[PDB]
Structure 1
Amino acid sequence: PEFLGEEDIPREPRRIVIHRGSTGLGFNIVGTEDGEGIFISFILAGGPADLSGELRKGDQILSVNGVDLRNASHEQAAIALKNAGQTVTIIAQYKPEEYSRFEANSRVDSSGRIVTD
């Protein structure tokens, strides 16, 4: 048996296109007023982000529709995403170590996966 859980999660940036018409994207972001990164904290089962099958908790949102979000505040990133239109092109990059700082009792294992105790 060949388990996915054993192999490394790619750390390279990826392009994800979410086609959502006029509904929510189906995920939550965490960030700071400082601009220390915008990260996916939660993906809604059955929502557009989930249906893409290409985003996960711990992804940093680098940009939306060409708009650089690496140094965005949580609020301005929210605005950008809500107003991104029906077709939303996200560049994301898996950053579990940076993400783990936000969530209590969380850490990264050898596979690169986020674990909460």
Structure 2
Amino acid sequence: HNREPRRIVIHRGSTGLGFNIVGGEDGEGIFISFILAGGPADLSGELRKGDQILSVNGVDLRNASHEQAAIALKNAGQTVTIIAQYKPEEYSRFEAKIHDLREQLARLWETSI
């Protein structure tokens, strides 16, 4: 898999981008948790679950809060230029939050874009 940052351009009409984000803790970043089948992100075929979102329309999200990221993505207009970087090892830390909890005995804080 390409692990280097990738410049992705999504064209959408008047809908969401059709993916979910998790993250926003300091040092954590903003990750794709889910891609909706038939949404603009899916149809493009370029984004994946476990991608970190580094930038949207020239707004740096590498250390954004969850709310900052959600608002930047929702308000990005119809031509969305994303810098993404595939980091599945870092992504598995979100899966470990739910796993660790069900073991130490649950949903992630997640927004649909």
Q: Could you say whether these structures have the same fold, taking a TM-score greater than 0.5 normalized by the shorter chain as the test?
A: yes
Question: RMSD across aligned C-alpha pairs, in angstroms?
Answer: 6.4
Cα 1:111–1:53 shift into 2, 3 Å: farther
Offset, 1:36: 1.7
How far apart are the structure 2 equivalents of 1:46 and 1:23? 12
TM-score of the pair, normalised by structure 1: 0.77
Structure 1 runs (4+) greater than 2 angstroms displaced = 32-35, 109-117
Where in structure 2 are there 5+ consecutive unaligned residues?
97-102
Structure holding more helix per residue = 2
How far apart are the structure 2 equivalents of 1:88 and 1:59? 16
Offset, 1:33: 4.0
TM-score of the pair, normalised by structure 2: 0.80
Give identity over the alignment, percent.
Answer: 91
How far apart are the structure 2 equivalents of 1:79 and 1:69? 11
**Relative CO higher for 1 or 2, CA cutoff 8 Å, sep ≥ 6?**
2
Number of the residue aligned with 1:91: 83
Cα 1:116–1:32 shift into 2, 3 Å: closer
Cα 1:116–1:70 shift into 2, 3 Å: closer
How far apart are the structure 2 equivalents of 1:75 and 1:93? 20
How far apart are the structure 2 equivalents of 1:45 and 1:111? 33
Where in structure 1 are there 5+ consecutive unaligned residues?
1-10
Offset, 1:34: 2.9
2:20 and 2:35 in contact (8 A); partners too: yes
2:18 and 2:112 in contact (8 A); partners too: no
